Ligand binder design. Structure first.
Ligand SMILES: *[C@@H]1O[C@H](CO[C@@H]2O[C@@H](C)[C@@H](O)[C@@H](O)[C@@H]2O)[C@@H](O[C@@H]2O[C@H](CO)[C@@H](O[C@@H]3O[C@H](CO)[C@@H](O)[C@H](O)[C@@H]3O)[C@H](O)[C@H]2NC(C)=O)[C@H](O)[C@H]1NC(C)=O
Ligand SMILES: C[C@H](N[C@H](C(=O)O)[C@@H]1CCCN1C(=O)[C@@H](N)CC(=O)O)C(=O)N1CCC[C@H]1C(=O)O
Ligand SMILES: *[C@@H]1O[C@H](CO)[C@@H](O[C@@H]2O[C@H](CO)[C@@H](O)[C@H](O)[C@H]2NC(C)=O)[C@H](O)[C@H]1NC(C)=O
Ligand SMILES: *[C@@H]1O[C@H](CO[C@@H]2O[C@@H](C)[C@@H](O)[C@@H](O)[C@@H]2O)[C@@H](O)[C@H](O)[C@H]1NC(C)=O
Ligand SMILES: [Ca+2]
Ligand SMILES: [Cl-]
Ligand SMILES: [Zn+2]
Length: 603
């Protein structure tokens, strides 16, 4: 560790810890910057040399974290929890958590190499017939093909190509991760991840939320299943069994927006799939990012800085480079460099992803002057919700008309049902998937799910919650959890379930602050500077205060609550129940063992 980056001495009291935290701040920004920069160089240019450089940067980060972590415990272990300054407690509490820096050198190097190899495997996997990549080739197949056989080839090809080689690395990663966090006092890595929410009843509270939401999903599922049956027939769709996992428009069946044309109940109302109009009008990636920015500035939030426009990667490179295409937002921890890396495609769903990522950037901009340990969301679900809340306003038929994507305007019951059904295909279909991913991972970290049951327990949960089945037989050579980005890239997932509930609480509060008095699902907070100011107070807080209190200041309640989501969807919830009843549907999938047959002469 360079001399300028090492911790000195400080007195063993609160006045000293304050000076300790200020000296830490200075050197942490340098160490974090070099680590984020090396990660950027690799993720926009996957090469063996760039991976080597990223591993060396990660090792330096661990050396820094150990030195300052050990100094914090040396001086403050018996007194930090009684400090008067609540922000200083949170800073010291974070610095004394070493994570992977608890491992000995040889195991640190093994850990860093596993992260690098798992990332490379996921983002360079191909399906060959001449080879298709996930983004854009396989993505476009899953969204627009209606050939059962072509969808099956793409789904099976991707899951085999990405998942099978990841499994031995993921086993080794799990054991090293658990060994590291056991030294911080956690029973396993999952217990450390859940601790970020500072709620002793976290798992029960989530289960109670899902009980309120499940009927809405069961009814959307049965309605969509019926539509698929009319197109694919009784051989490939069982009206009392799970839906084949490759027929819902998306590689993970996690958002169903791309099958809207098969389910839309009132098709002579205005056409809400505005992707065609974006194409017809010549929208490109940079248009999409500028339109998102202007929503933020309409609220008197910050524009994107020059450093963002000069540094970001907003299209997939055409120069034969391998990149990580999965969209992401970047804080370089120097209060100046902020970027997005996205292989942007011209579609309405991608316009929503652009808003999602710009919400992350806006948080970074607003909390950049806090101490580095407090530059995070009040909890991770807050960070995930910011951009989605603004996109709820952008998606409204009224707002799409204002930006030239919907010429005709209607305000009637049929048009509302169309809109709420389209929104449900995104927000309601996702809920079981958002909930189940970390149930799977918590069981792997705790040891309830050993390697011998990775795929058995994954498909148990996929069927239990989403009501889908794999369209070809799977066994424990397959590792289908690994074919989802966040698993090999070690990103937690329960934050997205939390976000999809929270964003409707945020929306209701901002709409009220803006003075809006119509139906919640027709609110558009565009140009509301009062709503902007309420949101800004959240963003500028970072993690300096307990999330329960920040939430109470914003929405008037100190807990997650499903009521605003239920209020938003109420009209289509009622309508779908009526339709399924009149159609005589069975809600659920009691033929839980059913799988579809293979196509004749496949492949
Ligand atoms: C689409 O249309 C709805 C429904 O409008 C209502 O029903 C129609 C059949 C007509 O009879 C309309 O004249 C009638 O308003 C609109 O929702 C309605 O918005 C108005 C405000 O613009 C609401 O009135 C307010 O209600 C609050 C109390 O909640 C009072 O304090 C206010 O003084 C004011 O009276 C009305 O409650 C609301 N109705 C419903 C069912 O939500 C909606 O605004 C419109 N959408 C667009 C984009 O124009
Ligand atoms: C498209 C989105 N990409 C993630 C996100 O933006 O959350 C990326 C990859 C993992 C983290 N991440 C970041 O950008 C972080 N750096 C943010 C931060 O540091 O706070 C994604 O995975 N989403 C969108 C909703 C559903 C879910 C999905 O598509 O499965
Ligand atoms: C992708 O990364 C490679 C390194 O892995 C870069 O290659 C270097 O390019 C510079 C150009 O100024 C040369 O001076 C180095 O000798 C190259 N290194 C190696 C190992 O070949 C490459 O430039 C990067 N590509 C892009 C587009 O950034
Ligand atoms: C696991 O599955 C592997 C490949 O899938 C199999 O081959 C296709 C063509 C179908 O027969 C499908 O039903 C099978 O699952 C096999 O290579 C492998 O031997 C299977 N078993 C084990 C223990 O790996
Ligand atoms: Ca981050
Ligand atoms: Cl999380
Ligand atoms: Zn996000």
């Amino acid at each position: 560790l360079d001399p300028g980056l090492q911790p000195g001495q400080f007195s063993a009291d609160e006045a000293g810890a304050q000076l300790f935290a200020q000296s830490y701040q200075s050197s942490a920004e340098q160490v974090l910057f070099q680590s984020v920069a090396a990660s950027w160089a690799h993720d926009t240019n996957i090469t063996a040399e760039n991976a080597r450089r990223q591993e060396e940067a990660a090792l330096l980060s661990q050396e820094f974290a150990e030195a300052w972590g050990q100094k914090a415990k040396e001086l403050y272990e018996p007194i930090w929890q009684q400090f008067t300054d609540p922000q200083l407690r949170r800073i010291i509490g974070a610095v004394r958590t070493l994570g992977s820096a608890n491992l000995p050198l040889a195991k640190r190097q093994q850990y860093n190499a596993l992260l690098s190899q798992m990332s490379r495997i996921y983002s360079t996997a191909k399906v060959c017939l001449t080879c298709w990549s996930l983004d854009p080739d396989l993505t476009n197949i899953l969204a627009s093909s209606r050939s059962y056989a072509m969808l099956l080839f793409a789904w099976e090809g991707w899951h085999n190509a990405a998942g099978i080689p990841l499994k031995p690395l993921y086993e080794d990663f799990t054991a090293l991760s658990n060994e590291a966090y056991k030294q911080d006092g956690f029973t396993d890595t999952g217990a450390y991840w859940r601790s970020w929410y500072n709620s002793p009843t976290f798992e029960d509270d989530l289960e109670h939320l899902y009980q309120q939401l499940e009927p809405l999903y069961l009814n959307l599922h049965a309605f969509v299943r019926r539509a698929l049956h009319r197109r694919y027939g009784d051989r490939y769709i069982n009206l009392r069994g799970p839906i084949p996992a490759h027929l819902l428009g998306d590689m993970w069946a996690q958002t169903w927006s791309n099958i809207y044309d098969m389910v839309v109940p009132f098709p002579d109302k205005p056409n809400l799939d505005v992707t065609s109009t974006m194409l017809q009008q010549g929208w490109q990636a940079t248009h999409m990012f500028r339109v998102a920015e202007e929503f933020f500035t309409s609220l008197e939030l910050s524009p994107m800085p020059p450093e963002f426009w000069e540094g970001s990667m907003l299209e997939k490179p055409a120069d034969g480079r391998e990149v990580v295409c999965h969209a992401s937002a970047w804080d370089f921890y120097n209060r100046k460099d902020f970027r997005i890396k996205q292989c942007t495609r011209v579609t309405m769903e991608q316009l929503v992803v652009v808003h999602h990522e710009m919400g992350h950037i806006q948080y970074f901009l607003q909390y950049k002057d806090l101490p580095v340990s407090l530059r995070e969301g009040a909890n991770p679900g807050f960070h995930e919700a910011i951009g989605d809340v603004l996109a709820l306003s952008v998606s409204t038929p009224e707002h799409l008309h204002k930006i030239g994507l919907l010429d005709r305007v209607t305000n009637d019951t049929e048009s509302d049902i169309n809109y709420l059904l389209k929104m449900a295909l995104d927000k309601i279909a996702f809920l079981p998937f958002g909930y189940l991913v970390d149930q799977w991972r918590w069981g792997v970290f705790s040891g309830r799910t050993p390697p011998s049951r990775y795929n058995f327990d994954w498909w148990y949960l996929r069927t239990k919650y989403q009501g889908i089945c794999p369209p070809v037989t799977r066994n424990e050579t397959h590792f289908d959890a690994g074919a989802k980005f966040h698993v090999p890239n070690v990103t937690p997932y329960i934050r997205y379930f939390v976000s999809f509930v929270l964003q409707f609480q945020f929306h209701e509060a901002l709409c009220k602050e803006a003075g809006y008095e119509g139906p919640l699902h027709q609110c558009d907070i565009y140009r509301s500077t009062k709503a902007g100011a309420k949101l800004r107070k959240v963003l500028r807080a970072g993690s300096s205060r307990p999330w329960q209190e920040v939430l109470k200041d914003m929405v008037g309640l100190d807990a997650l609550d499903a009521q605003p989501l239920l209020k938003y969807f109420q009209l289509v919830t009622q309508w779908l129940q009526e339709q399924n009843q009149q159609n005589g549907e069975v809600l659920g999938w009691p033929e839980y063992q059913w799988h579809p047959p293979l196509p004749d002469n496949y492949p």
